[PDB]
Design an enzyme around this catalytic site. Structure first.
Site, PDB file in Angstrom:
ATOM      1  N   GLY A  13       0.776  -1.164   0.021  1.00  0.00           N
ATOM      2  CA  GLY A  13      -0.070  -0.042   0.070  1.00  0.00           C
ATOM      3  C   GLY A  13       1.074   1.242   0.049  1.00  0.00           C
TER       4      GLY A  13
ATOM      5  N   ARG B 199       7.214   1.659   1.024  1.00  0.00           N
ATOM      6  CA  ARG B 199       7.423   0.070   1.309  1.00  0.00           C
ATOM      7  C   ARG B 199       7.983  -0.573   0.121  1.00  0.00           C
ATOM      8  NH1 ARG B 199       7.690  -1.093   6.627  1.00  0.00           N
ATOM      9  NH2 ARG B 199       9.756  -2.025   6.124  1.00  0.00           N
TER      10      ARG B 199
ATOM     11  N   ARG C  36       3.107  11.067  -8.857  1.00  0.00           N
ATOM     12  CA  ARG C  36       2.585  11.347  -7.567  1.00  0.00           C
ATOM     13  C   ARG C  36       3.079  10.658  -6.462  1.00  0.00           C
ATOM     14  NH1 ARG C  36      -3.234  12.682  -7.766  1.00  0.00           N
ATOM     15  NH2 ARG C  36      -3.762  13.151  -9.619  1.00  0.00           N
TER      16      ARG C  36
ATOM     17  N   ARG D  57      -0.645  -8.383  -4.007  1.00  0.00           N
ATOM     18  CA  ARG D  57      -0.725  -7.483  -2.855  1.00  0.00           C
ATOM     19  C   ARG D  57      -0.034  -7.858  -1.861  1.00  0.00           C
ATOM     20  NH1 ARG D  57      -2.294  -3.476   0.475  1.00  0.00           N
ATOM     21  NH2 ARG D  57      -3.575  -4.191   2.186  1.00  0.00           N
ATOM     22  N   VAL D  58       0.815  -7.051  -1.302  1.00  0.00           N
ATOM     23  CA  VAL D  58       1.430  -7.593  -0.044  1.00  0.00           C
ATOM     24  C   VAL D  58       1.275  -6.279   1.028  1.00  0.00           C
ATOM     25  CG1 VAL D  58       3.306  -9.109  -1.021  1.00  0.00           C
ATOM     26  CG2 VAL D  58       3.677  -6.694  -1.088  1.00  0.00           C
ATOM     27  N   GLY D  59       0.399  -6.757   1.779  1.00  0.00           N
ATOM     28  CA  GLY D  59       0.184  -5.780   3.064  1.00  0.00           C
ATOM     29  C   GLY D  59      -0.054  -6.184   4.291  1.00  0.00           C
ATOM     30  N   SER D  60      -0.760  -5.273   4.940  1.00  0.00           N
ATOM     31  CA  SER D  60      -1.081  -5.637   6.619  1.00  0.00           C
ATOM     32  C   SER D  60      -2.907  -5.542   6.859  1.00  0.00           C
ATOM     33  CB  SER D  60      -0.331  -4.718   7.522  1.00  0.00           C
ATOM     34  OG  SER D  60      -0.433  -3.470   7.189  1.00  0.00           O
TER      35      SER D  60
ATOM     36  N   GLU E 199      -8.944  -5.069   5.606  1.00  0.00           N
ATOM     37  CA  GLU E 199      -7.768  -4.273   4.758  1.00  0.00           C
ATOM     38  C   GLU E 199      -8.641  -3.496   4.132  1.00  0.00           C
ATOM     39  OE1 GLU E 199      -9.006  -5.762   1.942  1.00  0.00           O
ATOM     40  OE2 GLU E 199      -7.031  -5.494   1.098  1.00  0.00           O
ATOM     41  N   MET E 200      -7.992  -2.947   2.977  1.00  0.00           N
ATOM     42  CA  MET E 200      -8.747  -2.068   1.970  1.00  0.00           C
ATOM     43  C   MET E 200      -8.546  -2.079   0.453  1.00  0.00           C
ATOM     44  SD  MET E 200      -8.354   1.502   4.572  1.00  0.00           S
ATOM     45  CE  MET E 200      -9.378   2.460   3.549  1.00  0.00           C
TER      46      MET E 200
ATOM     47  N   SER F 184      -1.367  -7.115  11.608  1.00  0.00           N
ATOM     48  CA  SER F 184      -0.299  -6.089  12.256  1.00  0.00           C
ATOM     49  C   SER F 184      -1.156  -5.168  13.456  1.00  0.00           C
ATOM     50  CB  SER F 184      -0.076  -4.958  11.275  1.00  0.00           C
ATOM     51  OG  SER F 184      -1.271  -4.047  11.193  1.00  0.00           O
ATOM     52  N   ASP F 185      -2.353  -5.590  13.431  1.00  0.00           N
ATOM     53  CA  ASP F 185      -3.347  -5.304  14.514  1.00  0.00           C
ATOM     54  C   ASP F 185      -4.567  -5.940  14.916  1.00  0.00           C
ATOM     55  OD1 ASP F 185      -5.584  -3.334  15.856  1.00  0.00           O
ATOM     56  OD2 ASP F 185      -3.950  -2.127  15.647  1.00  0.00           O
TER      57      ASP F 185
ATOM     58  N   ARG G 122       7.970  -8.572  14.375  1.00  0.00           N
ATOM     59  CA  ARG G 122       6.882  -8.060  13.397  1.00  0.00           C
ATOM     60  C   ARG G 122       7.700  -7.810  12.124  1.00  0.00           C
ATOM     61  NH1 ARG G 122       5.900  -1.644  13.530  1.00  0.00           N
ATOM     62  NH2 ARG G 122       8.235  -2.199  13.230  1.00  0.00           N
TER      63      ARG G 122
HETATM   64  C1  LIG Z   1     -13.120  10.185 -15.533  1.00  0.00           C
HETATM   65  C2  LIG Z   1     -12.770  10.711 -14.374  1.00  0.00           C
HETATM   66  N1  LIG Z   1     -13.195  10.051 -13.228  1.00  0.00           N
HETATM   67  C3  LIG Z   1     -12.672  10.500 -11.868  1.00  0.00           C
HETATM   68  N2  LIG Z   1     -11.864  11.739 -11.747  1.00  0.00           N
HETATM   69  C4  LIG Z   1     -11.324  12.023 -12.840  1.00  0.00           C
HETATM   70  C5  LIG Z   1     -11.606  11.744 -14.177  1.00  0.00           C
HETATM   71  N3  LIG Z   1     -10.713  12.421 -15.125  1.00  0.00           N
HETATM   72  C6  LIG Z   1      -9.975  13.435 -14.370  1.00  0.00           C
HETATM   73  N4  LIG Z   1     -10.331  13.283 -13.039  1.00  0.00           N
HETATM   74  C7  LIG Z   1      -9.532  13.722 -11.720  1.00  0.00           C
HETATM   75  O1  LIG Z   1      -8.243  13.911 -11.940  1.00  0.00           O
HETATM   76  C8  LIG Z   1      -7.415  12.943 -10.935  1.00  0.00           C
HETATM   77  C9  LIG Z   1      -6.640  11.980 -11.745  1.00  0.00           C
HETATM   78  C10 LIG Z   1      -5.394  12.968 -12.188  1.00  0.00           C
HETATM   79  O2  LIG Z   1      -6.203  10.996 -10.877  1.00  0.00           O
HETATM   80  C11 LIG Z   1      -8.789  12.373 -10.163  1.00  0.00           C
HETATM   81  O3  LIG Z   1      -8.450  12.322  -8.616  1.00  0.00           O
HETATM   82  C12 LIG Z   1      -9.963  13.278 -10.357  1.00  0.00           C
HETATM   83  O4  LIG Z   1      -9.964  14.405  -9.537  1.00  0.00           O
HETATM   84  C1  LIG Z   2     -10.203  -0.758  11.054  1.00  0.00           C
HETATM   85  C2  LIG Z   2      -9.386  -1.127   9.828  1.00  0.00           C
HETATM   86  N1  LIG Z   2     -10.159  -1.121   8.627  1.00  0.00           N
HETATM   87  C3  LIG Z   2      -9.438  -1.225   7.340  1.00  0.00           C
HETATM   88  N2  LIG Z   2      -8.333  -1.822   7.138  1.00  0.00           N
HETATM   89  C4  LIG Z   2      -7.301  -1.760   8.398  1.00  0.00           C
HETATM   90  C5  LIG Z   2      -7.870  -1.495   9.826  1.00  0.00           C
HETATM   91  N3  LIG Z   2      -6.917  -1.594  10.722  1.00  0.00           N
HETATM   92  C6  LIG Z   2      -5.891  -2.093  10.048  1.00  0.00           C
HETATM   93  N4  LIG Z   2      -6.152  -2.028   8.694  1.00  0.00           N
HETATM   94  C7  LIG Z   2      -5.177  -2.586   7.601  1.00  0.00           C
HETATM   95  O1  LIG Z   2      -3.824  -2.508   8.340  1.00  0.00           O
HETATM   96  C8  LIG Z   2      -3.046  -1.215   7.740  1.00  0.00           C
HETATM   97  C9  LIG Z   2      -2.111  -0.865   9.062  1.00  0.00           C
HETATM   98  C10 LIG Z   2      -2.646  -0.643  10.045  1.00  0.00           C
HETATM   99  O2  LIG Z   2      -0.631  -1.349   9.139  1.00  0.00           O
HETATM  100  C11 LIG Z   2      -3.940  -0.408   7.240  1.00  0.00           C
HETATM  101  O3  LIG Z   2      -3.029   0.250   5.836  1.00  0.00           O
HETATM  102  C12 LIG Z   2      -4.979  -1.563   6.454  1.00  0.00           C
HETATM  103  O4  LIG Z   2      -4.578  -2.016   5.223  1.00  0.00           O
END
Ligand SMILES: Cc1ncnc2c1ncn2[C@@H]1O[C@H]([C@@H](C)O)[C@@H](O)[C@H]1O
Ligand SMILES: Cc1ncnc2c1ncn2[C@@H]1O[C@H]([C@@H](C)O)[C@@H](O)[C@H]1O
Ligand SMILES: Cc1ncnc2c1ncn2[C@@H]1O[C@H]([C@@H](C)O)[C@@H](O)[C@H]1O
Ligand SMILES: Cc1ncnc2c1ncn2[C@@H]1O[C@H]([C@@H](C)O)[C@@H](O)[C@H]1O
Ligand SMILES: Cc1ncnc2c1ncn2[C@@H]1O[C@H]([C@@H](C)O)[C@@H](O)[C@H]1O
Ligand SMILES: Cc1ncnc2c1ncn2[C@@H]1O[C@H]([C@@H](C)O)[C@@H](O)[C@H]1O
Lengths: 237, 237, 237, 237, 237, 237
Positions: free
Chosen positions: C20, C24, C43, C87-90, C179-180, C203-204, C217
């Site tokens: 994420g 990392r 970015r 994807r490698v995360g927590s 996670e997300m 991690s939690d 950890r």
């Molecule tokens: C078709 C479409 N849908 C959603 N966001 C769009 C878009 N065309 C441009 N944007 C926007 O510009 C950001 C891009 C650069 O990640 C986005 O964060 C946003 O602010």
């Molecule tokens: C309450 C809750 N909801 C969603 N994801 C969660 C969470 N608590 C932890 N995570 C996940 O663990 C990552 C962090 C804490 O290392 C975070 O980046 C995330 O991927």
């Protein structure tokens, strides 16, 4: 012939009685129908066609749940020209004044299923029975000295629901019986232009539980089939 | 004993094979099980318990649709201590490269039913099988020289859906097979802490249609049961 | 080059590991990859390409959330010929038996998001990982003497959710980690015909509540990364 | 007195006929009721009480839309002891066989609104009329030599809807008429334990497209009103 | 310090400008702020605090998507005393009369995300900006001779949406710009008691297909920042 | 003339004030307009057109609920050239710091109605007012020494809602007033290309239970009308 019914047009009558458990089809045929002949055996869903007071009538189980009865009702409607479908079975009650063995006629059917929303653009479809069929059923019940209750049924997808609280909601809105097919059958009937009605006898409560005997179920069950059969005759007249 | 299973704890093994059509239970018991004994007959859902290479195993149909198999799987899990449920049956395919008679292992199961949303606060629940069971099934298939396909199944509430376009969507997202139970069984397994897996053989296409014979279905069906049974043994090892 | 990735076809390997946190990604490239060259910085979402035991491998952050990772994985697949994403995360734990430093492999991912519903005509799409990648990971972990748990992850849109009740639901239905991104990445993989897998270390804890920050950890995080890298090697053989 | 009704208990009969247009209420009171006294004028929503063939009867407009009629019917039931509400209005036709001047009786009402879902935990509540009131109306119509059609009505929130596709869906599933209150009134009746019925004359067609304005149109409207009034008389006997 | 922000109460000003791109925050701090000091680097989400015309101001990226900016805006509000959040980003236009480099102020924000429905019991929460901040931004713009449209933005979860038709719906309803955060920032501001506003620069046209053009980027971007910074001063006065 | 408005293009001014109560429109025309002329009486929904400080202005009730005002606002916009609609009504407060007689300007409008989701492909459409009209109303108020809060309103479908908890959610999110039309008027304005604004007078507290108080009604009501009328003049300038 169809995927689930190994028969040809003409094999079933224009009116079909459908009990939940398949075993009841054979019983209905030999107890109430004369000159009954077997017309289906696929998957063990025995179908029969005979006559009741000269009136041609068929009977075949529809399995448990909306997905199952939706298949049979559809094929009967579009492949065998069936015009009326009457589901006969039992239900659980949530209203304190509705007692075990009471007869319930589902004029309408609520549900937690999504089949009707899929058919109706995710809007509310009032799954209802054919009115004449409801009145025929009520009058036939009356003629047999039976006190029939008419209103909403609730067709659940899950017999073992996680949300026990929904039964309180059902009670608050006057649901007379809880079963698992009505809304599905009413939906199909509406989709393919046919008529349907569900008739249930209260099998148990969802509060406490009354205790009786199969002796008080035999003819109560026979009473229901009698209602269904006599209602068809009133419908013809 | 339960509402739909007239048996006592101990009657079923910790592993249960479940075919769609009830008729197949008796067939599985006399063809693959030794010392089989009858343990259930309610509503015609014949149940049997026996052994496969000394391994205790039960078999009983689950009826058609999510509402039906949800009832049996639940009672088997909470009332008879069943640990693993393996559904064996057929499915329709939407992918051109998936052919008639191919074996499909449902690692996951999509659905248009609302049962899982009712359980999961109206969010998306990924209805999945037990991983070890999937790998056992794949390896057992391999050992029998069978080429098994693993991925998503789609459990439909309506066999005769109004939205024919959804099949295009299913194809676009790689659905391997279309049936009517997987998502329901996976949901129950998750709700009551047990394991489940669905194995299907492609019964037909939803585009055109290949033509064969029951001779090319007999042992293909036997192959599937063999896969299911051998997979249990690998699971024990 | 695409909107969020300033690179050209060939700069990435056909397999991409994605944490994420972009910082990392650099950590992973410096620790396990030989001759790692930075291939993207748009970015600040650092991307790197190098070799692991002779195999060309790439690693790049995907940001936080389904919306973010959906953009990167999609561009990697449709414009850089990437065929696999790991994807490698927590994640946070909800089940009491899931301890800290446990390695979780999401063969499936439940979600809060509406993205898959938008894709799947508002029905339930079971966001699953590619089966072979899951198995490759289990075996690589085994070879490393690590017991990995395979099951459901929960991808949330709100790290700070207003409804703390969902955690009990997640626990009841057996979610292994919260996670997300998983559900988002699996949605993309299915939409554009690629393969994906999510591996996480706990991690939690939310059941017993607890974080983490030690040599142990960090040792488990590195094990997870070795599992990911070794699993791609097994995928080739 | 309640927020929208400036009257006192007793000013209304236990049966209330309700047209959408308040001016229509005055018309009904002047045409069929003897000694009709105005009992409410708040917001110009004219209410009247008089006698029909000796029976105490009330009539009062409910405004346009579910939100509007939901307020009035609810206050009538919980604060003025009203036990029956009969909506008497006009609807648009969708089915080709449903002609102008046909009398429609909604034993059920589909809807666009979210009101019943709010009430029924987001499930499908089948908004139905009271069975006895439906039958009383059918018989009164029969006695008057009028063939009434009984079935589903569709209650819309948007008279000018952005999706003209729903009309085909309504036609396919057999909706007899389109109006804007039935589903709301039936929801209220169930929530507060009262009885309701909606009777409509087709004033416009959407299948063949056509309005109406003649002596014959006004004759049919009056027939509908006589059906409503005569049906309450039958309800008493 | 919070999970995603390694800083201390006092390190951030009470008003924070937030672009999606972390590198843009750095550019803003170096171009418009004096005595700028970096206060966060976690996950590379650079954060800075300096002064503008003597006013203490902070700037920190929020990442892409609702889930990302929600985390950061939430942490800033509950642990760093941030009262005002002003998002300064780019958006895609759908209206023909809206051209590139145009500045749009989102007084409202539509979305296909489920975050606000989860907060608002599945109903429609109108995600809006703080009126005074909108008024301040419109005024600061006039004083700068810069044009600015005030209306609705659409925050999408999928930048690569499979639903092209939706852009037509957005156009029909006057969506001025399509981005990915506004609805989330506004949802968070209302939930945690703060004020927010989103100012966007039209970077491309979803129809004509053409991202940022020539060196017009920096110039228009600088206009937006200037407008944002000046609007903060009007607010103080 | 339209289905609900018997008038002709030209009978209405390009700006129309609309209270829920038809009798209030009459009061407004007689109290604030000169040479007022009645232009509509259909369904008793009185409509008037006069002059204020020389400006041609109209006033007509819209009835209770989203379905009602939607019809009228739509007809005015498509057949009578109405460009601006200003609703002037009453609302219920949920915030403790919001007191009776308070004037609230709805720059946004939340709702539990489904009308906007039907228009916006089931996504979240932020129903907002025209910025300039909001700004005009805030200014006209300052010039009158009248206080006025600007924020979100909640348009409910059920005045007698069975969901009491929802008021807590409204409070948590800062809903200034609870009424029944705003979200609909704004939805219509966006759909048919016009501008709208809702100004409400807090008539009671949903918590403390106490509708309009003493003679403070007419006075506060007159303040709202004055604010509405003056804001129209600022707009022209
Ligand atoms: C078709 C479409 N849908 C959603 N966001 C769009 C878009 N065309 C441009 N944007 C926007 O510009 C950001 C891009 C650069 O990640 C986005 O964060 C946003 O602010
Ligand atoms: C309450 C809750 N909801 C969603 N994801 C969660 C969470 N608590 C932890 N995570 C996940 O663990 C990552 C962090 C804490 O290392 C975070 O980046 C995330 O991927
Ligand atoms: C809790 C619950 N949910 C859904 N249906 C239920 C139920 N309890 C009972 N039923 C219905 O009644 C039949 C049994 C009791 O004979 C069953 O076949 C069934 O039709
Ligand atoms: C269109 C469609 N929808 C849902 N399931 C379907 C289907 N077509 C086939 N099936 C599945 O395959 C079984 C038949 C073909 O043996 C059936 O029992 C069933 O499990
Ligand atoms: C398109 C459409 N949608 C909803 N209701 C409709 C309709 N067309 C007609 N109606 C109903 O008929 C009444 C009028 C036209 O007499 C109206 O008051 C109304 O009850
Ligand atoms: C609890 C509650 N819910 C919805 N609207 C409410 C309300 N309390 C007051 N109002 C409003 O005042 C109008 C009443 C008089 O019909 C309504 O139109 C509205 O403007």
């Amino acid at each position: 012939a169809t995927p689930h019914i190994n028969a040809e047009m003409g094999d079933f009558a224009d009116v079909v009685l459908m009990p939940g458990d398949p075993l009841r089809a054979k019983y209905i045929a030999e107890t109430f129908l004369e000159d009954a002949r077997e017309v289906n055996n696929v998957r063990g869903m025995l179908g029969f066609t005979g006559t009741y007071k000269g009136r041609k009538i068929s009977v075949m189980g529809h399995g448990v749940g909306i997905p199952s009865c939706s298949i049979y009702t559809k094929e009967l409607i579009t492949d065998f020209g069936v015009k009326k479908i009457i589901r006969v079975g039992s239900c659980g009650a949530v209203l304190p004044h509705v007692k075990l063995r009471d007869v319930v006629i589902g004029m309408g059917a609520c549900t937690d299923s999504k089949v009707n929303r899929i058919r109706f653009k995710d809007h509310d479809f009032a799954a209802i029975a054919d009115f004449d069929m409801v009145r025929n059923a009520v009058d036939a019940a009356k003629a047999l000295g039976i006190d029939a209750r008419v209103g909403n049924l609730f067709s659940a997808d899950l017999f073992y629901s996680p949300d026990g609280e929904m039964f309180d909601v059902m009670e608050k809105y006057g649901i007379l019986g809880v079963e698992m097919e009505a809304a599905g059958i009413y939906g199909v009937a509406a989709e393919f232009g046919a008529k349907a009605l569900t008739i249930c006898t209260v099998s148990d409560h969802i509060r406490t539980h009354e205790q009786t005997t199969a002796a008080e179920r035999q003819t109560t069950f026979n009473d229901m089939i009698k209602i269904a059969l006599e209602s068809v005759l009133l419908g013809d007249k």
